[PDB]
């Protein structure tokens, strides 16, 4: 898509963005299944062609709000690849080694290599995200991390890897609504921990976060897709549709080449 | 389903295994995959668990000749699984820096830690297989690699982890077959490469290898599992089923509001 | 000198050693710490020999109790080497990612290569140690651990490593003194942690799981080698000594032109 | 200290810096060892400081033509610190699985962590070195690659990384002396590869690469010292004496907290 992309004008306004936008997609839930399981095929063929080719690395970074489908997109970019060639790289709390080093050390080690598919579940936006909000470290250290970030993403770029970034967007409510749901479910309710609670009342500080990390870091080489993620559907049906037309884009071909006794 | 189990008694034949058996299921084809499907909901709970107690590691080792079912086998794992719990590390041909260490150092490094599941697509047992098979090294050095695995193996297992090592067993008139489909798919005959020709003359070699290895490393604490597998229906049904019971049998408990 | 290595008998008693022993030595300080000036040089040709024909992998093992001598142990080994070719890989406290995995994984993945000197500065050794002192898992847990020891190293030595562990061995008096005069010194009291005075109690409890680990351990293929380390100049001379004589025993040669 | 600092001008000539310099030691090879001596006392002192406040984090960056003295510097810094806060991470010919990331990715993994002292032997700068003079990858590759490592660095000493880059300055002919003395010796020989004799008729271009490569990537943050090293007492006595004051500088304080029974 290109109304999804955010252009590299640093005019990236977030309010602009409707998490119940579902107006890419002509038909409802029924329809983006079988457009999903059309995308799916496409995927297969696709990943296989570039774990064949061996040439380029793939980026796929997924953001959003805790409940906002990191979870639920990687299960449907993994229901169209081989296992064998994609893989996911999560980021949680760093470990006093990972603090040790750059905040890029840890995000660095785990780039996709040539013929992969990476997925960063979190990434290194973090360090700008969480790490703002809650003031891990002081504004004068986390604001030149804008440039860094575009930096090392120009140099990944440069150096073969297509980086596609997803903001999954979803409101304050859904969110509500979501986390209720995971309480009520005693093979979910694992998932809470202390002070998610009072995190929600900081809401509005990852959505300005988030505004300011997306508007500072969409590049021609690296842009942000901002998915409206309200609707599983609508979610998981186009961030499959923008994956497949960007490989399909990469224009792979099966490496040049008998009867077995 | 425990007659695909090789007890550690060391008598192990592998003749005693038809690659065409499918006696363990009371069905066919469909029914296998409605069976399958069961099997891959089961699993979803099974995995979601592992992770959620963060206490149990898993290991599933698959070993099979080329075409045997490795790749298929690791779909259908995937099918009832959340990829961010479970990840495969397959085993290649060595580099130098991996050969200027002991063969188990690569192997090592990537064992599930608590509350993960990890498929090795291949594993320490090539070490005993194309090693031993193609002379890598001289037998007075493959042969005391039993005695290592079996050792390794326990370390793992008294430390927590769960191993399954599965043998995906394969006819070579099956693997015939599905060797001249890849060529015959433009899609691919990427996979074929010339030395596989050579390396079919070497098919009894490679089943004596795999009988070794089993007989010398089929222990309590890590079993093989002997996989009649020409039928890719019951091999992803059987070894589906296996995984399955095992993470059953471990019993796994979800560790110990209303929102404005 | 072979009056240091242990016997793979089982039946090793600490007892026997003295940290105060100096008898391997005719002489003192100053004639040992010329003799190690020979054994530096020798060394400096033995792990370049090592390096050029990138064939052996050298496995060093240190363990002991706080201000046994670890520290003075790796500068006395490096002022005979070329740092290109020779590391320590030190292990402390576990992380949350180490304990994911069995104790032996952080340890394996830090293994010398073909051509290269690893000295461990403490080691898998630990997980029998302050794991069995602290009770950090239950006995019926860390029993077992010896048997997976023996055939850890027994695989690293078949697929050519050569392994040295030397337990440096001082007294509790000695330690006390060494102790007392990192607090004393404000560029060392750094050193100091609080828990470091209730561990002193443990003392006695470090020295039977020493004897136990070492008594369960030392093979023909992975020797323990206690070495009396109350006198510095001693326990340097002596490892050095040990280090040099296997190292030799290698029969090392340069590539051919 | 001043005349060696290659200034983030973008004006940097080469031939400005006479590999036989000795002009900042007054006196000769004697008085130079024993003024590395006191040196090399004074670095323990400020190596166990920098590990013991666990703050800082250390990169010295060795770059030589073959024989121009990465190794002999690398036994001088080991002669004045704990090996168990120092460590050397060298380059060598990269592997399948290098290539198969971008080039900065197995440079980043090797970065000091807090506390610690990072000897590169060799570095990032080989791809701009030897891949720019063997044309391993075309210009319009290389020439990014500049950008790539201006930035790469400057987010390292933001996030906390001390860098100091040595160019170890060799003439043609001295270099020509060393490795006939290599061959000569037959506890040398060893490191005498043949793709060497005709590498000696590409010295010309690894100057202007080396040249290029300065220019480009001294900063203020990250500066570049060329060291005369014709003279490896003089080489080992000056780079000493640029890492002890560069430590000093950094004004370390061991970290602030009993008759033991
Ligand atoms: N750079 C970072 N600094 C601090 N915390 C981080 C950083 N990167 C990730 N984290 C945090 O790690 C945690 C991972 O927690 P967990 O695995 O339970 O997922 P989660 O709570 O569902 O995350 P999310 O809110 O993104 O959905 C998150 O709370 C995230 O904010
Ligand atoms: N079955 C599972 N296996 C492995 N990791 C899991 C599993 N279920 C959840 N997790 C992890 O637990 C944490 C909390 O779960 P969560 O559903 O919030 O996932 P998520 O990736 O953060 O997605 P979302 O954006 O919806 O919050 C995340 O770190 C997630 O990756
Ligand atoms: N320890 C080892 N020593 C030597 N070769 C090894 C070792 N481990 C794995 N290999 C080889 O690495 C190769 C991996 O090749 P590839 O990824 O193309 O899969 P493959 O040919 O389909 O393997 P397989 O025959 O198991 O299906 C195999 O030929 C395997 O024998
Ligand atoms: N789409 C893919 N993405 C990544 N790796 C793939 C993909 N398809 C195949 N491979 C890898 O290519 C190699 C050859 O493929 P192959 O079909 O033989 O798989 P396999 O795992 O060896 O299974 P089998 O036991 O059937 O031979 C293997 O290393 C396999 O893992
Ligand atoms: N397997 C392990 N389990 C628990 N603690 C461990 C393990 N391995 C090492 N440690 C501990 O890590 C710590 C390292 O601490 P530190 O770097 O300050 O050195 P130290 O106190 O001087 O150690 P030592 O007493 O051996 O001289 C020691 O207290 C050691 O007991
Ligand atoms: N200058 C230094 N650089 C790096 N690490 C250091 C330095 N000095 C001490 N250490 C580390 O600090 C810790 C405490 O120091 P310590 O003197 O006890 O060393 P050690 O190796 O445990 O030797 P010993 O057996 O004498 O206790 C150890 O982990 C040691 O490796
Ligand atoms: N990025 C790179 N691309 C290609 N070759 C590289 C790269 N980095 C390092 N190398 C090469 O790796 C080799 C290392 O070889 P070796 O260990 O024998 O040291 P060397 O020949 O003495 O190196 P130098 O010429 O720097 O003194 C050098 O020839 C160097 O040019
Ligand atoms: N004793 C040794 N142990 C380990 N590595 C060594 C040893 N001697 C030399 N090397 C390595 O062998 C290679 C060739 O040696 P060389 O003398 O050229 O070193 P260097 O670091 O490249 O220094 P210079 O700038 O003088 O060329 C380098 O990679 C060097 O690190
Ligand atoms: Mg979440
Ligand atoms: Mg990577
Ligand atoms: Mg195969
Ligand atoms: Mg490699
Ligand atoms: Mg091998
Ligand atoms: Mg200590
Ligand atoms: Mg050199």
Redesign the pocket.
């Known amino acids: 898509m290109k109304k999804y992309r955010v252009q590299p004008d640093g005019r990236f306004e977030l309010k602009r963005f409707d998490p119940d936008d579902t107006s890419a997609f002509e038909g409802g839930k029924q329809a983006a299944l079988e457009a999903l399981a059309v995308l799916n095929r496409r995927l297969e063929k696709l990943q296989e062609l570039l774990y064949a080719e061996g040439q380029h690395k793939v980026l796929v970074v997924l953001?959003?709000?805790?409940?906002?489908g990191?979870?639920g997109t990687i299960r449907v970019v993994f229901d169209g690849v081989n296992p064998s060639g994609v893989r996911v790289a999560?980021?949680?709390?760093?470990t006093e080694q990972e603090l040790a080093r750059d905040?890029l050390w840890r995000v660095h080690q785990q780039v996709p290599r040539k013929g992969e598919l990476v997925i960063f579940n979190?990434s290194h936006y973090?360090?700008v995200?969480?790490?703002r909000v809650?003031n891990?470290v002081p504004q004068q250290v986390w604001q030149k991390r804008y440039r860094h970030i575009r930096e090392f993403e120009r140099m990944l770029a440069d150096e073969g890897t297509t980086i596609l970034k997803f903001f999954l967007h979803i409101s304050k409510d859904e969110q509500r609504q979501r986390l209720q749901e995971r309480l009520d479910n005693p093979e979910k309710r694992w998932?809470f921990?202390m002070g998610?609670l009072e995190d929600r009342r900081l809401w509005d500080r990852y959505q300005e976060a988030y505004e300011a990390a997306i508007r500072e870091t969409s590049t021609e080489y690296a842009p942000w897709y901002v998915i409206p993620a309200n609707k599983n559907w609508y979610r998981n049906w186009l961030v499959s549709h923008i994956l497949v037309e960007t490989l399909e884009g990469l224009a792979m071909q099966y490496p040049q080449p008998i009867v077995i006794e």
């Open positions: 953001q959003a709000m805790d409940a906002g990191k979870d999560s980021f949680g709390v760093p905040y979190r973090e360090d995200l969480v790490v809650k891990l998932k921990r998610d």
